[PDB]
């Protein structure tokens, strides 16, 4: 199935309070595996999954962390420059805090070949420049980013991203999926139950719970006699349990006595077949 390797770079200026801070995190699918923080005393790339703390890493590259460290310190340095130049482009005072984000990686087909590369930037939370899926031209969001586009196009920067994607990106994603097989590929189903919560004479809340599922992707819906109630149900965002699984619920207010007319539907890649369940 379709897997992804994504790094997330955030730098934030702090006028007066000192030098910009830089944070990086790497994910495979919904699973974080590394972190970096330019404010840590002797700052290094740090494993943040168990399957990154295991001897295979040394064996594939004994310089894994030192190299990742080197690259994050580079990215951190470049972003300190980006924050100065973006002030200029936008004609901003030195006084306010601003933010540069970068999100990059690759998706793999079930073919297991490169499906798609990403390399995109935001400034103060808004779309700045993104590499197009040709992997040669950039989409500038505004007239500041157009300067960046002219510069990067003229220097052929896109090419260095291309070969990272076609080289290292796919290569390491397959390594991670292999070595992290038990965590990354082994997909825990939701354990689902319905709870019953009186509100008044007129409505009882039927809340459908999905707990302990990985990956985060799920569909959680109430139907009355086969008819979807999506427009008239309460559905929280999928939220992390804290143990690397996710939680979700969907609630519907129904007349008391009507409880067995409602069926909760749960679909998740970890289920042999879609769960259907009811009150008690």
């Amino acid at each position: 199935g379709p897997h992804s390797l994504r790094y997330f770079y955030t730098s934030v200026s702090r006028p007066g309070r000192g030098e910009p801070r830089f944070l990086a995190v790497g994910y495979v699918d919904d699973t974080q595996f590394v972190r970096f923080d330019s404010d840590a005393p002797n700052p290094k790339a740090e494993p943040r999954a168990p399957w990154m703390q295991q001897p295979w890493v040394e064996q594939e590259d004994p310089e894994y962390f030192h190299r990742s460290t080197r690259i994050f310190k580079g990215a951190a340095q470049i972003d300190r420059g980006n924050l100065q130049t973006l002030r200029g482009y936008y004609n901003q005072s030195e006084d306010g805090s601003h933010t540069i984000q970068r999100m990059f990686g690759c998706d793999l087909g079930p073919d297991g070949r490169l499906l798609r590369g990403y390399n995109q930037y935001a400034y103060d939370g808004a779309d700045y420049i993104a590499l197009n899926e040709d992997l040669t031209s950039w989409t500038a969001a505004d007239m500041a980013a157009q300067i960046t586009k002219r510069k990067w196009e003229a220097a052929g920067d896109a090419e260095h991203y291309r070969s990272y994607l076609e080289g290292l990106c796919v290569k390491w994603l397959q390594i991670y999926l292999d070595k992290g097989k038990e965590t990354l590929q082994r997909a825990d189903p939701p354990k689902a139950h319905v709870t019953h919560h009186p509100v008044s004479a007129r409505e009882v809340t039927l809340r459908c719970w999905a707990l302990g599922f990985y990956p985060a992707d799920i569909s959680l819906t109430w139907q009355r006699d086969g008819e979807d109630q999506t427009q008239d149900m309460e559905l929280v965002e999928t939220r992390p349990a804290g143990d690397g699984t996710f939680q979700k619920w969907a609630a519907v207010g129904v007349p008391p006595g009507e409880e067995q007319r409602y069926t909760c539907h749960v679909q998740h890649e970890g289920l042999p077949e879609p769960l259907t369940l009811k009150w008690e």
């Binding site: 590394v34 973006l86 482009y89 991203y161």
Partner: peptide, 9 residues
Amino acid sequence: FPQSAPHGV
């Protein structure tokens, strides 16, 4: 495995 941009914006 990460990558840093060749040049600044």
